[PDB]
Amino acid sequence: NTIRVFLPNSQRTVVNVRNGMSLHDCLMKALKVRGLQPECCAVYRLQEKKPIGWNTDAAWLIGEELQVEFLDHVPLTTHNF
Ligand SMILES: *[C@@H](c1ccc(OCC(N)=O)c(OC)c1)[C@H]1C(=O)c2ccccc2N1C(C)=O
Question: Mutation test of ligand 1: which of 31, 34, 40, 72 has the most ligand atoms closer than 8 Å to its C-beta?
C-alpha cells in the first residue's frame, strides 16, 4: 500500500503505509535517506495543496499524492533548557 510523495527540488519517493502508522512514521526513513527531517518540513495533501499534520493517520491517505516542503528559515524561539 504505497503513497506517492513529492519532495523539494523536484524529488519524489514512494512510501509504504501500514494501518495506524502516522505520516511522520511513514515518511521518516524516506526523508532521512535524502538528508531531510520531518521536523524541518511541512506536508500537504494534493486535492491544490491542503496542509495536514505529521500525526495524520497515513492509512486514510492511501491513493492520494502528498507534497513535502521545507519550512521557511526564520529563527525559532530559544529552547535550550
Ligand atoms: C531543520 C529545521 C528548519 C527550520 C525549522 O523551523 C523554521 C521555522 N521558523 O519554523 C525547524 O523547526 C524544527 C527545523 C533543521 C534546521 O535547519 C534547524 C534550525 C534550528 C533548529 C532545529 C533545526 N533543524 C532540525 C529540527 O533538524
Answer: 40
Dihedral sign (CA 63, 64, 70, 74)? negative
- Burial level of 51, CB count in 10 A (0-12/13-18/19+)? exposed
> CA-to-CA distance for 54 and 48, rounded, in angstroms?
19
- Residue-range domain boundaries for the chain: 2-70
Would you state the CATH architecture of domain 2-70?
Roll (3.10)
C-alpha angle with apex 47: 70 to 13, nearest 5 degrees? 50
Distance CA(74)–CA(72), nearest Å, equals 6
- Is 64 in contact with 46 (CB distance < 8 Å)? yes
Known binding site for Zn(2+): residues? 79
Would you state the cell numbers that stand for residue 59, as one nine-digit string? Answer: 492509512
- All 3 cell numbers of residue 28? 521518516
